[PDB]
From a paper:
Crystal structures of THAS (here referred to as THAS1), a second representative THAS (Cr_021691, THAS2) and the structure of the promiscuous homologue (Cr_032583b, HYS) were solved and mutants revealed key residues that control the stereochemistry of the product profiles. The HYSs perform a single, chemically straightforward reduction reaction that immediately neutralizes the reactivity of strictosidine aglycone/cathenamine. The biological unit is an elongated homodimer, with each subunit divided into a substrate and cofactor-binding domain; the latter also being responsible for forming the dimer interface. The active site cavities of the HYSs are framed by helix α2, the catalytic zinc coordination sphere, and loops 1 and 2, with the NADP(H) co-substrate binding at the base of the active site.
Structures were obtained for THAS1 and THAS2 with NADP+ bound (THAS1, 1.05 Å resolution; THAS2, 2.10 Å resolution) and in apo form (THAS1, 2.25 Å resolution; THAS2, 2.05 Å resolution), while HYS could only be crystallized in the apo form (2.25 Å resolution). In both THAS1 and THAS2, a network of amino acids holds NADP+ in place. Most notably, Glu59 of THAS1 anchors NADP(H) through a bidentate interaction with both ribose hydroxyls, with His59 playing a comparable role in SAD, although here the interaction is with the 3′ OH only. The proximal zinc of THAS1 is ∼2 Å further away from the cofactor relative to SAD and thus may play no direct role in catalysis. However, it may have a function in maintaining the tertiary structure since three of the liganding residues are in the substrate-binding domain and the fourth is in the cofactor-binding domain. SAD/CAD utilize an active site serine that protonates the alkoxide that results from reduction of the aldehyde substrate; this serine is replaced with a tyrosine residue in THAS1 (Tyr56) and HYS (Tyr53). Interestingly, a non-proline cis-peptide is present in the THAS1-NADP+ and HYS apo structures. Closer inspection of this region in THAS1 shows that when this bond is in the trans conformation, the side chain of Asp340 is projected into the cofactor-binding site such that it would prevent NADPH binding. In silico docking with THAS1 positions cathenamine between the nicotinamide of the NADP+ and Tyr56, which is located on helix α2. THAS1 loop 1 contains Phe65 that also projects into the active site and may interact with the aromatic cathenamine substrate.
Residue numbers in the entry:
A (entry chain B), B (entry chain A): 12 to 355
């Protein structure tokens, strides 16, 4: 219904099959930033959403919730951005502005928070975003390998800060060395933690040590390895997207330790009361992060040279990438090269 | 195997029936406090243990993990306590002293923590306790109505402080208005919270308002009442000992809110990931509390005149009281008058 021509990829139904899709964006309002999309990260969440895993997908579904681009126009009241600036946008682009969560700068938890993909995401030529939901991209962070910071980076960083899993010398587990996990690992290392990777096989063992500097690696299907590490970890970041038990993770925690649940399985977790009571353990979940947190995160990543390991793909490759995500078959995030491959 | 004659009540088997039982206590060592027991609180945990609910009861089981008494002998190196002092003892009376939890003054989480009831509890004439696990009893706290502070009071206070559910103006739910719950409620009120009681029926509604000053009362099995309170609570103290879902409690929490699980059911909790992810909620369990926390708790209770509502009973009534615990049929804790009713 709007004046600015847009084009990208959309799924028509819960098959999740993407196709070229024409749509539109609002004209640039007084407080808006229009940007040419350069790179669009993608991830398991897009695959899950495209197939309506969570039951809340609206079709047609235009993916794209982690973008970097260059400003093409700003509204008359925008001061902070100018034409040509490199900018990033994460998954939340509107909130109520007036509730407790919004006023306390944790607006990602606004009960009326609006996601970028809810009104056509930004695997597209252009995006138009209120200036309060855009960041200036740091000059020392690559655009292609940095874009997943707007999804994986913030999602890890926010709870790591909130729950105190950001201290040197503590022992932090990362469950699932995937898209989100490899970034969480890099943050934990930069905070000075000793990192244990908890993985479903030995395939990523060498990577964990030689790519990531893990201190130890546990295969979750090896009972002796898991048992040997009982009660050793201060915290665990659980990234696993598929059905799994929390009991083995809780067993790895010290008393008072914290399990942070980021992944979103369809099957509910079965949690015996003693698995928490014995040792007074904590389970917390977390989603995304606030704009204040994203700004802190991106400055921290720039200072510590934290980026993702990315496979840069074309628009035409997206359905292949989606199929590869069904076995997490990427090292470690797909990034779509919009600027060079989306046809105009 | 020890020299000092002791006598009290013990259960022989998982019927949970208590009978007179003779046993012994160690002589008073250099750092020990011998005390004559004056009041022994009892509670659902004693009923549960007496019937082996958790599978770890060793018979004979001498109940009594919350006591107030009077010092009768002190060891040669004891300075803090003197003969005749009124003192309190909670459930943990020995720890390893050298692990991370012990050295950080959270020794109730010592993996080798020793409960008072594990080596014959103190529903008995005499107890002998290392001085580091005894507190001086405040003169302005009644012995009879105060003794449950050493079980219910600490169990509520410790996580309320640890997880920040101790701030004025916050909205705190108490699930299950029983032995533990009524004390937790009183602490919440003293911290300046607005309290919502979540209960299994209307039966305790008048008590909640008139006796406890609750701000609202929700029947958990009334969907309209529960739905009307969605997203309103900063935290919940869940005391429920029987099978229940956490989903309705999580739904009452605001984003970032905290559910504290204190009670201990047989059936595991089923927790859908979205029940935590939506709003970034926290579920923490907790057990007992540390000696440092007990001292702070008892000073807070003395300052704010926090006591339990108790029914003082004789030794001869204990089995009848235990039966009444099966339906929580007490307002709100039984306290055994050892000094006046345990026969010499
Ligand atoms: N909370 C938030 O705000 C937020 C934001 C973004 C994404 N997410 C969610 O986070 C989840 C993970 O996303 P991601 O991009 O990291 O996915 P991913 O790239 O597929 O990585 C997940 C990793 O988990 C492990 N794994 C996968 N399926 C498993 C299973 N069934 N059992 C055990 N381990 C399994 C694998 O690690 P190993 O090979 O080491 O075993 C895999 O590499 C998704 O559910 C997504 O929706 C949440
Ligand atoms: N974590 C710790 O360190 C610790 C320490 C002490 C005790 N505990 C545990 O805490 C639990 C509660 O102890 P308590 O002394 O408060 O017991 P209680 O005096 O029997 O009170 C429990 C209350 O929970 C509610 N309730 C009971 N059964 C229920 C069911 N099946 N479904 C729903 N609500 C139910 C009732 O409240 P309404 O009538 O309002 O519905 C009842 O009054 C026990 O499991 C005990 O072992 C734990
Ligand atoms: Zn993403
Ligand atoms: Zn809001
Ligand atoms: Zn008790
Ligand atoms: Zn210890």
């Amino acid at each position: 219904v709007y004046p600015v021509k847009a084009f990208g990829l959309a799924a028509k139904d819960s098959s999740g099959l993407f196709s070229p899709f024409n749509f539109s964006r609002r004209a640039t309002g007084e407080h808006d930033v229009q940007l040419k999309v350069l790179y669009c990260g993608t991830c398991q969440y897009d695959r899950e959403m495209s197939k309506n895993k969570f039951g809340f997908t609206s079709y047609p579904y235009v993916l794209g919730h982690e973008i970097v681009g260059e400003v093409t126009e700003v509204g008359s009241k925008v001061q902070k951005f100018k034409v040509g600036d490199k900018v990033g946008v994460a998954s939340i682009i509107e909130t109520c502005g007036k509730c407790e969560m919004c006023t306390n700068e944790v607006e990602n938890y606004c009960p009326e928070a609006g996601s970028i993909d809810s009104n056509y995401g930004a695997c597209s030529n252009i995006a138009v975003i209120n200036e309060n939901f855009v960041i200036r991209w740091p000059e020392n962070l690559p655009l292609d390998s940095g874009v997943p910071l707007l999804c994986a980076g913030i999602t890890a960083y926010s709870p790591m800060k909130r729950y105190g899993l950001d201290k040197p010398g503590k022992r932090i587990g990362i469950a699932g060395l995937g898209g989100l996990g490899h970034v969480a690992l890099r943050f934990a290392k930069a905070f000075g933690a000793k990192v244990t990777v908890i993985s479903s096989s030995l395939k990523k063992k060498r990577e964990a040590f030689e790519k990531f500097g893990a201190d130890s690696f546990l295969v979750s299907s090896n009972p002796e390895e898991m048992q040997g590490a009982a009660g050793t970890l201060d915290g665990i970041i659980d990234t696993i997207p598929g059905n799994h038990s929390l009991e083995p993770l809780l067993a790895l925690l010290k008393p008072l330790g914290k399990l942070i649940i980021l992944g979103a399985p369809e099957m509910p977790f079965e949690v015996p009361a003693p698995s928490l009571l014995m040792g007074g353990k904590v389970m917390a979940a977390s989603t995304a992060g606030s704009m204040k947190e994203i700004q802190e995160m991106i400055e921290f990543a720039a200072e510590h040279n934290i980026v993702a390991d990315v496979e840069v793909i074309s628009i035409d490759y997206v359905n292949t990438a989606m199929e590869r995500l069904d076995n997490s078959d990427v090292r470690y995030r797909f990034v779509i090269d919009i600027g060079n491959t989306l046809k105009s």
